[PDB]
Subunit: 390 residues, 5 copies
Amino acid sequence: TQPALLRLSDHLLANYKKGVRPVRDWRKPTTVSIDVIMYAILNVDEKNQVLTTYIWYRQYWTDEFLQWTPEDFDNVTKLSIPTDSIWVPDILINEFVDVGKSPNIPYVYVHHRGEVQNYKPLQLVTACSLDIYNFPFDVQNCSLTFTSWLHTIQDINITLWRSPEEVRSDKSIFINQGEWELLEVFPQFKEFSIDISNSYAEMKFYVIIRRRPLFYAVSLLLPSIFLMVVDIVGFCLPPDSGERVSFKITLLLGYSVFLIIVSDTLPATAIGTPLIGVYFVVCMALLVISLAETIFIVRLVHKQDLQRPVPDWLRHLVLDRIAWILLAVRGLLQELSSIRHFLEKRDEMREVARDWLRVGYVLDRLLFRIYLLAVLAYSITLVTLWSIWH
Amino acid sequence: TQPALLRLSDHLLANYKKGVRPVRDWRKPTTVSIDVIMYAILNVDEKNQVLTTYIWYRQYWTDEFLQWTPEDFDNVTKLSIPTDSIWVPDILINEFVDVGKSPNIPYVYVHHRGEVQNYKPLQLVTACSLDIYNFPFDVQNCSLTFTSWLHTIQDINITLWRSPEEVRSDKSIFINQGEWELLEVFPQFKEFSIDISNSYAEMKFYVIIRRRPLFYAVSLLLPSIFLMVVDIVGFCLPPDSGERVSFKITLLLGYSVFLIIVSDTLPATAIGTPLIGVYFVVCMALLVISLAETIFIVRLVHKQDLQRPVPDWLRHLVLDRIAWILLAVRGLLQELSSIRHFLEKRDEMREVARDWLRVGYVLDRLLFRIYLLAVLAYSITLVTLWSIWH
Amino acid sequence: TQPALLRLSDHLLANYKKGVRPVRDWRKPTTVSIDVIMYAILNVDEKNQVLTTYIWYRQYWTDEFLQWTPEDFDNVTKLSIPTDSIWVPDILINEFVDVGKSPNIPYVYVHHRGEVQNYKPLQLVTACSLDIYNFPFDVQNCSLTFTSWLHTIQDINITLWRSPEEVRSDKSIFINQGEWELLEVFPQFKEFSIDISNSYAEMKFYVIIRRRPLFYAVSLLLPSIFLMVVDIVGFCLPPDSGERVSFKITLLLGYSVFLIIVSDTLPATAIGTPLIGVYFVVCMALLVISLAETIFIVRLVHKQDLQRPVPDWLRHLVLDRIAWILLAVRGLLQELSSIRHFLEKRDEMREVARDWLRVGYVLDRLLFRIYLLAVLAYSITLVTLWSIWH
Amino acid sequence: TQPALLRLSDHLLANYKKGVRPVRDWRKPTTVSIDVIMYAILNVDEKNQVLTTYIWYRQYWTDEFLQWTPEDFDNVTKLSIPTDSIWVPDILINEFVDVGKSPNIPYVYVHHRGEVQNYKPLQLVTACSLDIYNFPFDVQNCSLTFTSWLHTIQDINITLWRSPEEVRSDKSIFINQGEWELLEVFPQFKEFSIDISNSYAEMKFYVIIRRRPLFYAVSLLLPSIFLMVVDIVGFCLPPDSGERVSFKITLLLGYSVFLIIVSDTLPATAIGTPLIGVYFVVCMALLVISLAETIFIVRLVHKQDLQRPVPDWLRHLVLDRIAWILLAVRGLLQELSSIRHFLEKRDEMREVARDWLRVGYVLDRLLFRIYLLAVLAYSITLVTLWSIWH
Amino acid sequence: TQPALLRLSDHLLANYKKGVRPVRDWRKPTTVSIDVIMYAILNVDEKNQVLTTYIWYRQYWTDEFLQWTPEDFDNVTKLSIPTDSIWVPDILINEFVDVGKSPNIPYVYVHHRGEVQNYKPLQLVTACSLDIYNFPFDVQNCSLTFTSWLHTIQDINITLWRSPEEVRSDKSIFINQGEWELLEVFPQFKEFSIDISNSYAEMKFYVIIRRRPLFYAVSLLLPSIFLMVVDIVGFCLPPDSGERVSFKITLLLGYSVFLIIVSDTLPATAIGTPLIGVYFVVCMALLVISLAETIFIVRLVHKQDLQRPVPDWLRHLVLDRIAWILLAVRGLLQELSSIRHFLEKRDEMREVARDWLRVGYVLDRLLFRIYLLAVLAYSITLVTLWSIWH
Ligand SMILES: Clc1cccc(Cn2ccc3c(N4CCNCC4)nc4ccccc4c32)c1
Ligand SMILES: Clc1cccc(Cn2ccc3c(N4CCNCC4)nc4ccccc4c32)c1
Ligand SMILES: Clc1cccc(Cn2ccc3c(N4CCNCC4)nc4ccccc4c32)c1
Ligand SMILES: *[C@@H]1O[C@H](CO)[C@@H](O)[C@H](O)[C@H]1NC(C)=O
């Protein structure tokens, strides 16, 4: 007479108590078989160390009160029942630090043997230990522990819907265009107990994710390489030009502002600075060494009245070794003698300055070649370090 | 006696089960016809790759229990019934990453043959693949897949209220003053199944949106063009003025700070930098080439005591080819001879410096003209690339 | 016996159906009279083009089921009834893009003839077309369309509680200390229909708001005027000082950083830059013209060994028209003659440089006067454009 | 037999209507006595002009239906009753612009004579007029108007739980470590009516809060004082050194970037800039005056070939008043005469330059002393303005 | 016949009033035993002075109505009962300033003797007094006061589930990779009463947390040390080079921008600046002292025409003590005499300038050594202050 679904719902949900764990014998637990597949990784925030993810979640447990024989209800084998009308286990995540905003699924599937199937999408904001030591290339290992918050293992136990290898091999629906690439989701069963009897079942889903370094190549290497190139370009200025020191200090100011700006994107954790901070401070040290060498050569070549003739040891060393590696008439006479003496003093000062300038030029050329070799060695070291990672 | 609407509501909603799928025969699914119209695009966030939109959404399905004959109820053909009092399908979007804040519509229309019509606005925060390769002029292709989360295709199926061409041609209520211009909404039906029997109906609305580049013309082209113009202006400074290198390095510092500031607005995805990053680094390379040319010409013209006379080959080459392309009396004699020799040495140094300065000036003019031609060629290349897009 | 209010509530809310539109005859619509007064304008966001406002909103409709005679209930003419216990129309706003957070008013007034009065505060986040073409002085025109989302005009119709002139003249409770000044709220009734029969009642409240420009005078005009003043101040440096070009380029760098910082506060829409962007680029062009003049005068006055005597045409033109507008003894002779020739060459070079320096000084004074006149003309043009707006 | 509390709850809440105002005679209003004490001031946001506060709030009203005699119920005089089970007045705040997130208190106390006591914490986001004219030392006067949103004064009236002096003297639980110091909370009863009969009771709690200026001393005065100090330090550079104008312009650029950075923390309202903006622009004026006077002295002392001897009036004025305030032999003769004439011209130019340099040095010393006195006067004026405030 | 759990739930929750405090004798209070473990410290915000934490919270109280004998219900000793079906105490925290978003646990355990056990996670946003006086090394002392909001001590009283030493020793589940390290959680019972009879039970959990300074070593010491190092590097430039003052002022500008950028990360409270602000301003003062020394030496060594010979006292003092610490023929004669006099004047000026330059060089070396010693003393003082903390 009446529709089969209406009769079945009247048979099931009438005189049914949704606050009772659905077991005829209270000594057996309800085994909630859960399953998790990752849809997207919305945000990994290394400052507060929380991971935002969206997962598709499904679980099923045996409801010993929602059972019927199909033959009495027009051969119906399954029907959808509202989630509010039946008992639902309190499975949530330990690592929660903020309840997510996820849609509510109002219906669940019930089979004729009691297997209630619940599908639900979840937005998860969970705490995790984010090790940024290898920041551009770091691989993170975040856990998602599903468990019953109140019920012990004697009341609610948790298993897997699918074999752990199948869970590990899932990368199907994952949104992959973002910064973070999902490697694997590894499930593992554990019992959490700090008491002899109070044992709580758990299911740890180790979400392992890898950052894509292509986001940061242009943002990190390009400015540093650009400034190191313009350092070599500015090296060509003659030391006595009077513009070299200004050029170098302006370049150092530019590098300083670049560093203090890019530090906003560079994360910081209990480890401190990441590994690439060492490379950044090495580049800054190279620039400082360039500035110091420029100042030294400026000190050498600067013409000033206290300059004494170049010492014999320095003259020999630089200009050979480093070069190889690379009566009224009597009154008239007195006036001319005095004028000649003045001009001779001026010329002697000029020649001493010229000798010092030559020594400074040779040393500047040698130190420029040494600095260029050091920069090339640093660049090839970085290239080989990147190559063995690729 | 009683009002027609009260009697009709008593007839319908009494002994009516809202947890039962409204089919007299459980073998036929409820076909939920779906219609979606985009009202606005609130935010396209390429960093986290989520799309925020507001859509007007309506659906209708046949409720076989909410049926009556009009003649018994004062010829009423339709009435408004609360949403909470009837069965409502769980149609929601797969691409959800955050449940939106949308008003709740409490009433739905029910016709005398069971057609229940539901109208509701929806704020959607959905994941999408945002390709910013053509960032100023990129056109995005975001999908909105409506499906029943729990029910399979044997329970709930999805069709279109209107023909797909009519859905595609809809641009009526779209808020259009914003940054993003809606091109079309293209619906197309898929079955999603990773099981032999568990098939889920789906309806993908491909929301295709195009960015308006007028937001970024002033923010991008204007600073680069302005700095290129001032570079050409500063080219006019004489190479021996002692201010040209400072001008060039200050301009390079200004361009560096401009780049590191504008990089906050430039998005970054798994692709890396957008295509216009190539143009930006080409402009920076042109500035660096200008700086290198300035430093080289300064090296040539800088007067210093180690300068030797201009070599014959360079003198000929530059100053012809490039120019075409463009007794106490004896004691008195000795002192005068010495003074003349000092002045002769000074004059010879001055004349050698003058010859080198002439060579440097000619080369500076030639290289300035070459750089101007290169800048003009780059500008017209950019203009002709923009023209074929417009 | 019993209290009058208890008996009245028992008479009304018993056997009362809150899901039924309250009309004894279903052919007549329920006319919901709408009134809106604005409390404050919380935020106008020209980037996403959404308007956040707080309004005091009230409506009243005739409830044909909540009617009684006062004489039976101790002469009670009105009572407060919970909003959840009676039918409430679904009046909301089309322009919604985000449901606001507003307090829920649990009670409504019911009169003895069925007039149900509903008072409720509303926080509205609505989309609007924000034209920033006159950004400092722009007047915005944002609509608020109240309508029944589901019900057609045959079911729910909308009127005004007060005449449109009274609504237009309301500026009483409006919080006025903020950036935005409310001019008027203009109501207008319209029918929205894209079908022959499905006509929906609407009531558009055109909220017209005006920005207060005093927020931006100090933030916008003051830096530009200050940098223009220091430009004229630094213009006085002698062209041959060797510091004028550095001063000018430092000033241009300061203006560039000021522009790229203030661009964060300057909004951008589909129009592009606002009108004051033209004024800003004009000021930047004036600074660039000053820099170019400085470079030209430096080119003229710069002392270098390739300088030739000032041509007759330029000498006449500038220095008249522009100024008006503003034997061993024979061996002794040879050495003296050679020394005199050296000194004569040096003096000739010095005098040619002096003549060029004089020409450059006169041209610098003339161009300074021209530039000062141009700056004054620009300032008075801006002042007279502001005056006609005031 | 049964527990006293169970019997009392059965006696009270059975056949009790929570939608009815608890009065046996509908002509008497329910007097809701309000009491408010402030716990903390979470955020004062002068941009959007909203005040965020957390208050402890309690109210009590006479419920004429929740009355019993203690002797019948084991001498119980009060019991806790759920909030949802009884009538609760709709007391909320007019100044609301955003409903706060506050915990829900489920229970209220009911006395044997009907006095129902409701305790609840409230987070309040309310609009206020924030006058920032004295930004570092401003005192704010924000109101909190508690009133019934729907009920008129004939239905719900509002009084004070405690005397207004006791409310004014409350500073007990206030969290005081923050930026804002609470002075007093002043209650005042008003009637709000824009109709002859529709009068609404109100209770205005004038929350008066004072900002602690110690937050801003280091952030505001210290950079300005430091830049003034380095201005005086760099003043000592000789005017002809060639570095003074570069120093001054670099300092002005530093002050400009400091101003445009600190403007992010300086608020802006309809008043415009605060009062300390005048002091900041005075500091900018002093720096610009220093720069202009430096340029003037550079103009005086700059050695150039067009210099004429110092005029008698300027020489006398400065260097007295301001200083007090502070045959082949004939052919031989011709060559010697020509050489002497060249050297004499050079010496005359050198001496004229020396005289101009002396005049410039004396004027520079005088203007340095004048500028130092002006800076000291400004500093003591600021100190004496701060002292009368302290 | 029926399942034991169903019969037990029917026995318990039938005719059970969830709004009644569960005591057969109303004179006894319900002692709620509270236990708390900190899971993580999500955010410590010293600006608004709120502490965001996630805690695991459990409580148990005696329910005198949910009591049964196990032998009547198949030896069941405990069962899970929904939280909504039973009376739950209103325990919340005084220090709340924003209700947290925490998951809702629907079930609680009930034992056969009435012990109802409630487990729940809690996100807490609580006010606290954050003293930043020792900012990089500060240890905070935040309190969490759990109490019943409405109920007095005669109705609800609070104890500890575990002994206070056990609570103090808990650091098990705490997420420890973040910036803040948890030291201890110290519980302490207090009574809060501002009335003779209205005493409220309270329980304060003093959460003591310590910041990890390793976050800020690279962000604070590294830039300051780098700029101090480049200050010493630029100290080597000769004072008469003409680049030393530009170098020093550029370095000071770099330090100024570094300070005004790092001030965004440095917090500010009612105390004002933290203690390390003194160290920062001391470093800036050292830089200013270096700049003043450079300017003084530039004043000494600057060659200008008004230089008089070095005074005897200064010559002796510096160059000894500080060095130790570290007829037509008659017409021919007249012209020669005049030329010799000109050259003699020039040479005398040159020699006076040389003497002043020597004095300036010696003083520059002495002051460089003094400044280096001062910098070393400051560095070792900072190191020895850090060592006694470590
Ligand atoms: Cl990608 C994949 C890989 C293996 C197995 C499955 C099975 N499956 C089918 C559908 C479906 C699922 N739905 C969400 C979207 N609407 C239909 C139901 N949520 C799920 C949540 C967790 C685990 C599996 C599933 C799932 C899928
Ligand atoms: Cl723009 C357009 C173009 C063609 C057809 C229609 C039909 N239509 C009429 C009204 C209406 C609609 N409402 C929202 C505003 N209050 C009245 C009901 N929501 C809708 C949501 C999705 C699809 C269609 C509609 C719709 C519209
Ligand atoms: Cl300013 C003004 C101007 C004209 C008419 C009125 C009448 N009026 C009186 C009170 C009141 C009103 N309430 C909110 C505050 N608690 C009492 C009720 N909300 C309203 C919402 C919309 C329109 C009118 C009103 C209104 C006022
Ligand atoms: C209903 O409509 C029919 C026509 O279909 C008409 O004959 C009949 O009179 C109508 N009844 C009422 C009550 O309007």
